Design a protein around this ligand. Structure first.
Ligand SMILES: O=N[O-]
Ligand SMILES: O=N[O-]
Ligand SMILES: O=N[O-]
Ligand SMILES: [Cu+2]
Ligand SMILES: [Cu+2]
Ligand SMILES: [Cu+2]
Ligand SMILES: [Cu+2]
Ligand SMILES: [Cu+2]
Ligand SMILES: [Cu+2]
Lengths: 336, 336, 336
């Protein structure tokens, strides 16, 4: 492309929405390449992650853990204005696994409190990708403190299955999975700290055991269950984007399946089909497409069941509709 | 199909066999869809898992760990009669990852000791799938007490490679891998209990470390060696089904290979080929197809060698036949 | 082929080079099948793996960790002369995952100090494969002491993508990743031992936690950084072979991508494309192909960031050339 051409492309600002929801977008690109603008303010803040009042000094892109999903199409440019308020105490930056060059952008976006920066990159590869903060020397600490999210770079013509047939979803959810490593005192009680840096030494010791104290979705145990369960209806097509910036996970829609799963998260890699449990390595995002056939409650979990039911990696889906006795039926209900 | 159409389908009662063997079946479906009937009695029993006399309070479908492999064909119906003896102490149920609806069937099959239930579901997706108990509130505990197994839903036309060429096996084996979390006393000695519930609190603490004390095949260290080593002969085609309902595994046939491996366990997903070590995420089953070319003993392991040789994840294959010097030969035997 | 036919085949002696470099070879095979000859002397030796001076009694093929990459073409024969010097104290052998029979060669190459052996096998399957020592009863200990490496069996027609188009690399690097389990004293300080045998009991204890103290590339923290960082240029095509003989890893080229990744390491299995982070299960080798588009420093890591930045699994690439502002540009540098 020429220099003037890039400068002449339309610029479009988008209003982000907090996970698990996703901002307005079209599956098939509308018009030619655009420079899609996003702005995110970094917020260091204490959040409670379990039912025992356990605290973590989160480092949250846009104030949420995970950071929000940004959606663009292949060959659009993503132009992000990143802000680090003077009220914060640490330097931060951002690495887009979707980008090319300067460590994904980390080398060009190091901002101290009181500073901002604007990074632009061409989304040349289609798929869902992880993005995360990565200050040299303290990379895992920022990432396991919740400073990561994902973006989706849709093919300009939308999604397709391995045979080239269109796959159009009715709704999309973004489930960011987070491994936390919270220090405990000799009595086994989780410790609280006045400032983020105060917990650094204690936190790294726990990180080295490679064993998280919590593994959660949307920043807390149960954040996506109960009255916050995701929803769908029989017949509805749903895309579930899942990311884990630091550790492996194995998603499974209990009661359902992954009809088409881009396990590696890259759309040019044909999707696996009829999946029970898929695998997303730490440092990546993946996406699963499913058409609901049965109403009721479903569980969506990291299928190491200890991580899901003891550590927190479990969400729910409430589905409306009519039951299908052909697919499943209780011939004889539990009885003496 | 309507309830009437289903009621008219032929029915076939299958008699299950203990792993690693698989009940009689035909790779290519014989006739149209039918309701395949199975029965399994749940047995809470003590099992010894290592040569130090270590005990586990197993919760075993059909009395074995793993539960038996159930085989049907795509679009047949699987009708399971599940029984929970009055002699047992806990409520149990069953979730088939192969099924669609009510958490895989667990929501319709919760049975207290003294009860039974009959669940029918349509096997709409081809492949190997995990099945496991999942009582609300105590899911991982039952699964890591051995209450899990798998089923195989064969394509009606049998197996095929990525280009459609038929793949017909001479023998099939089912290796169920189990991660156990046995509590120890302050002297590093494994503890024993007189009841399942008695070990609950202690076990959950070990489960949370995400570090199993034992990782075994067919319920115990060395279970599939010696009197129980699997067999084959040079030239024979063997399908090795492998499942792990809670934790990741990486199977590898030492001395052999995975000629065709449906690593995700789903038959509509083309198999990987010429594999040395494949990967099966916790919560799934996979299947490898191999034609033996060399006689002798083979070791089949989870290739995290510590898990295989320190923790117990190792099985043996004794293969008969003529040695092939073209493939491998000792030009010079170990010598001065 | 008969013994006579093989004996008539041409023979080529190859000089091995130390990782991460690879001995000279041709991507497209030169002529017909050949007996490719390699010689490796095993050296039990003390090595330092970090800046603090932590010692490990390595068991090293060719004196390095990982052992060197051997390259042949499909259907060539690999003839290895393996020597166990009388200065060593343990018995050693070798299992080539690329071979067929006798536990990969392990059952035919057990040599005590002062002995040697020559093993020949036909490289029937294309791909990168792990090779490692495996003495009955002491398997994981030799492997996690560094006694493993990899080989590459190139298709006779060189590499191609999943659609048949040729993929020709300009450079190739072999990154061997090693999980180490070093004992610590009551002060949390790593222990040193006079003889390798002295460390066995303490080491096995650490091995059983399934938590390595160090995870490194080319035998040491920072081994592939600074003056030893890998190098490339904008426009250059690089193949990165990565192996892990005992534990899972998830490689990621920070700032770049895996344009084509044979994640399972087998060339007849179509490669995934546009990868951010790929996955190689313990007990296997994988390979990624990338054409650099941006100059500057890149980090190549196991993307569980704790393993990368706390445990040692991070390498660097220095890349020469012109920055591409179309791909990425800082619209606004960090500022107030
Ligand atoms: O930016 N490091 O993955
Ligand atoms: O039924 N939970 O895997
Ligand atoms: O030779 N054991 O993987
Ligand atoms: Cu940060
Ligand atoms: Cu990254
Ligand atoms: Cu149960
Ligand atoms: Cu399940
Ligand atoms: Cu050795
Ligand atoms: Cu091996």
């Amino acid at each position: 492309a020429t220099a003037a051409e890039i400068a002449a492309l339309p610029r479009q600002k988008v209003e982000l929405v907090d996970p698990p929801f996703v901002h307005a977008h079209s599956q098939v690109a509308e018009g030619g390449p655009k420079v899609v603008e996003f702005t995110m303010v970094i917020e260091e803040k204490k959040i409670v992650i379990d039912d025992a009042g356990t605290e973590v000094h989160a480092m949250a892109f846009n104030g949420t853990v995970p950071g929000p999903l940004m959606v663009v199409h292949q060959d659009d440019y993503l132009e992000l204005t990143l802000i680090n308020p003077e009220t914060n105490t640490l330097m931060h930056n951002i690495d887009f696994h979707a980008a090319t060059g300067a460590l994904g952008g980390g080398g060009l976006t190091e901002i101290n409190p009181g500073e901002k920066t604007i990074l632009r990159f061409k989304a040349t590869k289609p798929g869902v990708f992880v993005y995360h903060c990565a200050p040299p020397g303290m990379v895992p600490w920022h990432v396991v403190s919740g400073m990561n999210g994902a973006i989706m770079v849709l093919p300009r013509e939308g999604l397709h299955d391995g045979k080239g047939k269109a796959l159009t979803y009715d709704k999309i959810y973004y489930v960011g999975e987070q491994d936390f490593y919270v220090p405990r005192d000799e009595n086994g009680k989780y410790k609280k700290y006045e400032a983020p840096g105060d917990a650094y030494e204690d936190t790294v010791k726990v990180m080295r055991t490679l064993t998280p104290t919590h593994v959660v979705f949307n920043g807390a145990v149960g954040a996506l269950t109960g009255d916050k369960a995701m929803t769908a209806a029989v017949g509805e097509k749903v895309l579930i984007v899942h990311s884990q910036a630091n550790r492996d996970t194995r998603p499974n829609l209990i009661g359902g399946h992954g009809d088409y799963v881009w396990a590696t998260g890259k759309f040019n890699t044909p999707p696996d089909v009829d999946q029970e449990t898929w695998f997303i390595p730490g440092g990546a995002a993946g996406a699963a497409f499913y058409t609901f056939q049965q109403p009721g409650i479903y569980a969506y979990v990291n299928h190491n069941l200890i991580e899901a039911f003891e550590l927190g990696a479990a969400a729910h889906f409430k589905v409306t509709g009519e039951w299908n006795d052909d697919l499943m039926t209780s011939v004889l209900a539990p009885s003496g």
